[PDB]
Nucleic acid binder design. Structure first.
Ligand SMILES: *[C][C]([O])[C]O[C][C][C][N]C(=O)C1=[C]C(C2=C3[C]=[C]C(=O)[C]C3=OC3=C2[C]=[C]C(=O)[C]3)=C(C([O])=O)[C]=[C]1
Lengths: 434, 28
RNA sequence: CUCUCUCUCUC
RNA sequence: UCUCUCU
């Protein structure tokens, strides 16, 4: 039982080490200095280069249908250099085959898709913590208020089962609803070889959504949705009902701390053997890595670096939809809601004035650390809608879940003595997007 | 509009808050 | 609750 | 080689 755990830690550490040494190689090939190599924007550009090089289907489509004024075999992005204290952006182009060769050499001749999925999840968490998806919600007919279930909505399809565990109930419901809408518009959907393939995809997506749910009634209802040969308006409405029910009887969404490649690269250049020590995405390893890591970022004029650092922290720990009180307790500084953050996204646009831009250190440090959970809490005839409604009516927004679990100090590596928070003082806000 | 409910990330005791009247008013 | 799960379509 | 909190 312990041996399997140590092999799992070794495998995850192998992925992290590969990502870090790839970042080191990319920094060497880009002639970036230490400060420029620790910039979060440069790491974002490099990670996007990796992801676009290995996006096989998009690369093939680009070869068949070339883009306007772009070479379909070259990736690129904004790389920022500091000259005489002034930041300037550059668009440098790299062959996709060169990027693939460098990535494979980083992972010892193996095309380790696990690290790519890790970077994909990091980008998805950043997008979740930065940008809201209300327009897509309204277009598909779902309430804009179920944003807490839309974790991992920007994850592409190539993530697979690893990324499927991260995406929430809202995104899966949205994708299924898109499929049902396409079937409703065109009857030739679900027909032919493409019809068989999309039926298989629909069944698989329904099955992983069913695995997401906890109560028996929700599982039975998604089973009934899956069993329809030609799902129509009724199944789309039932999916909307399940999505709304997921607000109270929550689902099992897996949360992992996926750090930017700059942190991993700095750690690997420091001499940290993740293969020997081992890495966990749900334990103290990301917290310990973030405490002694220095990351720099680009601050547009009239912005608060503290707010940007809080945003990056929330993205790193996938705490976008977390209770603000527990997030502030773990961080030690007040996690301000999205409305009161005087900051825009991490990424810098191509039209920005790259002469007033400044650089700031990111405070990615927390007082306490906690275990990241997959569970959504405790949940306590042939029409299971009434049963679901009764179950949610019984629930109150005062029940204590995760009983006997607390936040551990950074020195408590083994998670022995928990600290339970007492939120029984004057009430702060609880919803990040509120 | 906004965020009605919390999706827990950290395994901590905590009350899990949600806007009960808003969720329930769509089920009455 | 870690881990392999692999992708209807570039979207 | 793109951009964006909040129908
Ligand atoms: C479908 C869903 O997912 C949604 O979608 C949208 C969002 C995301 N995105 C995606 O996916 C895509 C994108 C794209 C693009 C690009 C890419 C790359 C670069 O570099 C640039 C660009 O640009 C653009 C786009 C789109 C749109 C616009 O407008 C612009 C793609 C291509 O291109 O292909 C794909 C996908």
């Amino acid at each position: 039982e312990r041996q399997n755990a140590t092999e799992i830690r070794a495998s995850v550490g192998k992925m992290i080490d590969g990502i870090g040494r790839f970042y080191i190689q990319m920094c060497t090939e880009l002639k970036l200095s230490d400060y420029e190599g620790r910039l979060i924007q440069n790491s974002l550009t490099i990670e996007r280069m990796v992801l676009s090089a290995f996006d096989e289907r998009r690369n093939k489509y680009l070869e068949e249908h070339p883009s306007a004024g772009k070479d379909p075999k070259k990736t690129g992005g904004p790389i920022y250099r500091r000259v005489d204290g002034k930041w300037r952006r550059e668009l440098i182009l790299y062959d996709k085959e060169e990027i693939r060769r460098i990535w494979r050499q980083a992972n010892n001749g193996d095309d380790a898709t696990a690290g790519l999925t890790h970077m994909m999840i990091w980008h998805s968490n950043l997008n979740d913590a930065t940008y809201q998806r209300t327009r897509a919600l309204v277009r598909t007919g779902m309430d804009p208020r179920m944003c807490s279930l839309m974790q991992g909505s920007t994850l592409p399809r190539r993530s697979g089962a690893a990324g499927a565990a991260v995406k929430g109930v809202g995104t899966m419901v949205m994708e299924l609803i898109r499929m049902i809408k396409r079937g409703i518009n065109d009857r030739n959907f679900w027909r032919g070889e493409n019809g068989r393939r999309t039926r298989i995809a629909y069944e698989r997506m329904c099955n992983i959504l069913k695995g997401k749910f906890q109560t028996a009634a929700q599982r039975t209802m998604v089973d009934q949705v899956r069993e329809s040969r030609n799902p129509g308006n009724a199944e789309f409405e039932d999916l909307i009902f399940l999505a709304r029910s997921a607000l109270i009887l929550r689902g099992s969404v897996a949360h992992k701390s996926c750090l930017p490649a700059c942190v991993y690269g700095s750690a690997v250049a420091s001499g940290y053997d993740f293969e020997r020590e081992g890495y966990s995405l749900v334990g103290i390893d990301p917290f310990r890595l973030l405490q002694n890591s220095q990351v720099y970022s680009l601050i547009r004029p009239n912005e608060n670096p503290a707010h940007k650092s809080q945003l990056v922290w929330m993205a790193c720990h996938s705490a976008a939809f977390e209770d603000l009180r527990v997030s502030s307790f773990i961080r030690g500084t007040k996690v301000v809601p999205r409305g009161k953050l005087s900051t825009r996204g991490v990424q810098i646009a191509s039209n920005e004035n790259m002469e007033t831009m400044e650089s700031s250190t990111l405070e990615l440090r927390s007082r306490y650390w906690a275990i990241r959970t997959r569970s959504g809490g405790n949940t306590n005839t042939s029409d299971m809608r009434t049963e679901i409604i009764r179950l949610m009516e019984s629930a109150r927004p005062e029940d204590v879940s995760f009983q006997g679990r607390g936040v551990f100090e950074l020195s408590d590596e083994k998670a022995t003595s928990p600290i339970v928070p007492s939120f029984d003082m004057s009430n702060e806000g609880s919803y990040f997007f509120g | 509009s906004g965020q009605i409910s919390i999706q827990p990330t950290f395994s901590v005791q905590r009350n899990l808050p949600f806007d009960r009247p808003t969720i329930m008013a769509a089920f009455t």
